[PDB]
Amino acid sequence: MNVTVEVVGEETSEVAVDDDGTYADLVRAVDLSPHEVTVLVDGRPVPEDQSVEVDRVKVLRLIKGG
């Protein structure tokens, strides 16, 4: 699903995640994002099974390289 991710530096960006477990993740796995960024989710205890299985993660703008 859609989750707000803290981008290294300034401001906050929105990136798609796959660990969420929702339908959005299924399509996300095909990498259909114009930004093309790497999103990772830390295995931490959270009540995401209450309403809207969402998770907050960190993502860097574009791919890491040059």
From Swiss-Prot:
- Role summary: Functions as a protein modifier covalently attached to lysine residues of substrate proteins, as well as a sulfur carrier in tRNA thiolation. The protein modification process is termed sampylation and involves the formation of an isopeptide bond between the SAMP2 C-terminal glycine carboxylate and the epsilon-amino group of lysine residues on target proteins. Is able to form polymeric chains with itself at Lys-58, similar to ubiquitin and other ubiquitin-like proteins. May serve as a proteolytic signal in the cell to target proteins for degradation by proteasomes.
Which InterPro entries did the record assign? Mopterin_synth/thiamin_S_b (IPR016155), SAM_domain_containing (IPR053752), SAMP2 (IPR053833), SAMP2_halobacteria (IPR053834)
Q: According to the UniProt record, which cysteines are disulfide-bonded?
A: none
Gene inactivation phenotype reads: Cells lacking this gene grow similarly to wild-type in the presence of either DMSO or oxygen as the terminal electron acceptor, but are retarded in aerobic growth at 50 degrees Celsius. The lysine tRNAs of the mutant strain appear to be nonthiolated.
Q: This chain belongs to which protein, by name?
A: Small archaeal modifier protein 2
Q: Name one Pfam family in it.
A: SAMP2
- Cross-link Glycyl lysine isopeptide (Gly-Lys) (interchain with K-? in acceptor proteins) lies at G66
Any one Gene Ontology MF annotation carried by this entry is: nucleotide binding
Keyword check for Zinc-finger, yes or no: no
Keywords for this protein: Isopeptide bond, Nucleotide-binding, Phosphoprotein, Ubl conjugation, Ubl conjugation pathway
Please give the subunit comment from the record: Monomer. Monomeric and polymeric forms interact with NcsA.
Residues with PTM 1-thioglycine: G66
Gene Ontology biological process terms, A to Z: protein modification by small protein conjugation
PTM Glycyl adenylate: list the residues: G66
Q: Keyword Phosphoprotein on this protein?
A: yes
Numbered residues of crosslink Glycyl lysine isopeptide (Lys-Gly) (interchain with G-Cter in SAMP2)? K58
After translation, the protein is modified as follows: The C-terminal glycine is likely acyl-adenylated (-COAMP) by UbaA, and also probably thiocarboxylated (-COSH) to function in sulfur transfer.
